[PDB]
Amino acid sequence: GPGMGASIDDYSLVHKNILHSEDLLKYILETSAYPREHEQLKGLREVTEKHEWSTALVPADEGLFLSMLLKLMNAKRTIEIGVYTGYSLLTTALALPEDGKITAIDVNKSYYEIGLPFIQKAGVEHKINFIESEALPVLDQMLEEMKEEDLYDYAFVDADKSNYANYHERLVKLVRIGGAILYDNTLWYGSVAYPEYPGLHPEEEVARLSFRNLNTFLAADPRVEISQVSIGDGVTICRRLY
Amino acid sequence: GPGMGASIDDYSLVHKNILHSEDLLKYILETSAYPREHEQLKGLREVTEKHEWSTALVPADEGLFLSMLLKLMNAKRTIEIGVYTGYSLLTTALALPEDGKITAIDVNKSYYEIGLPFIQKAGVEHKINFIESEALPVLDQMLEEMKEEDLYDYAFVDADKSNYANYHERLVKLVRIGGAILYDNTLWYGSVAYPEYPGLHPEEEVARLSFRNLNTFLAADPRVEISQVSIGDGVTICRRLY
Ligand SMILES: Nc1ncnc2c1ncn2[C@@H]1O[C@H](CSCC[C@H](N)C(=O)O)[C@@H](O)[C@H]1O
Ligand SMILES: Nc1ncnc2c1ncn2[C@@H]1O[C@H](CSCC[C@H](N)C(=O)O)[C@@H](O)[C@H]1O
Ligand SMILES: [Mg+2]
Ligand SMILES: [Mg+2]
């Protein structure tokens, strides 16, 4: 994957869309996303499109959806898990107020440095505390020091696909009651729709099975309300009830 | 359409899906929507599926998305434009707090009375002020009588598909700053993706062109931020800026 393991040349699902045609996706992006995309998000996206792991990039229509959610819920303190070149992170930082704060976590700071010049030109780096680490230890350590008054409003989870369930057990305690936890890529290119799905790299199959298990679990987890949204590669929004 | 004019026999787009496969939509509904769908929403949906205008029903995964937005933005006073049998209306009434208030508007009260037993059994009918009328005169009268402190938090727009642009001009004044206006069906069965589209009957084609114009207009409208979401048949979330 992006952070470790096999390279992109052996993956299979890279170019698969969940929408019914390339034309429909292109219509959405050209009509409703690109005209509303910040100049620095455009720049970060265009440089990322040339990178070997560009398939991992959060797309422009999903980005505006994340921004909309952040603004509607008046988020101020957030956590961003799985940064890559920083498209979703820059989206969050642009949406938050001037005194908003983001804890951003990625195992690979070199990816972050691809997009960091655009984050800086947007004038929002001051909102970001970037931590280079596997996410799980950071979440474990936040749990030990987290005060109820410091709980996050919003968490975007987009790191090791096979580890979402472990992230969830920490995050339901790190976001406030009424706060949002978003799991990215929960339809896994549409491959979750079937018990079996041939032609996958072993890492893709691990992630596919993980999402099928996670989707079933979140739908029955009494601690949250959920909405799985067929935007991008699928995004499951969770809202903490207690 | 459901409110006036052509019968469903004319309509050419009813069996289209914006997602790549029926199996993926079925997966979303069975895994993430139906287990979280209120029993009275299920009953209302199942009786509506047998109705002649079933194609116009808001789907269950979109419903949970509306509920999620309502709760995340802490909405308390809303307006529902285009009720039909009441699926999105019952969704809203269940999502709002006990003292939440909905102004619901539809030209056909007989559709509303199909869903009314389920709304009553859900115990949330007290939140709903139903007005049998075309929407525009009601909205215009609201603008005459509205005060700054009675602005709506949220509007769901799902009525005459050829007239959304006229609704928008009232609703950008009726919803509070920071409030949400949602336009339903903005991808119109995917048919907006092409300038010309074959074999539609006049009403479907008028609506298709209305949505192409609307999508372009909303993307350029400085009064709002937008996010067009590929859920259901397309939902465009607008957030009032000034
Ligand atoms: N165990 C782990 N802990 C933290 N980050 C991890 C991780 N395993 C993989 N990652 C990181 O997760 C990222 C997934 S791609 C994230 C995409 C990004 N959200 C966007 O907006 O485009 C990669 O950068 C990868 O380095
Ligand atoms: N001019 C108008 N003013 C108010 N309602 C109208 C209208 N023209 C059509 N309608 C109504 O708009 C509805 C569209 S279908 C609405 C679906 C509904 N929101 C759901 O949750 O499933 C129909 O009930 C129709 O009667
Ligand atoms: Mg992702
Ligand atoms: Mg509709």
Swiss-Prot record, chains A, B:
What is the superkingdom listed in this entry's lineage?
Eukaryota
The entry marks the following residues as binding a divalent metal cation, namely: D158, D184, N185
Query: The organism's lineage?
Result: Eukaryota, Viridiplantae, Streptophyta, Embryophyta, Tracheophyta
EC code(s) of this entry: 2.1.1.336
Temperature dependence as stated in the record: Optimum temperature is 45 degrees Celsius.
Kindly provide the name given to this protein in its UniProt entry: Norbelladine 4'-O-methyltransferase
Which cofactors? Mg(2+)
Does the keyword section mention S-adenosyl-L-methionine?
A: yes
An annotated Gene Ontology molecular function: metal ion binding
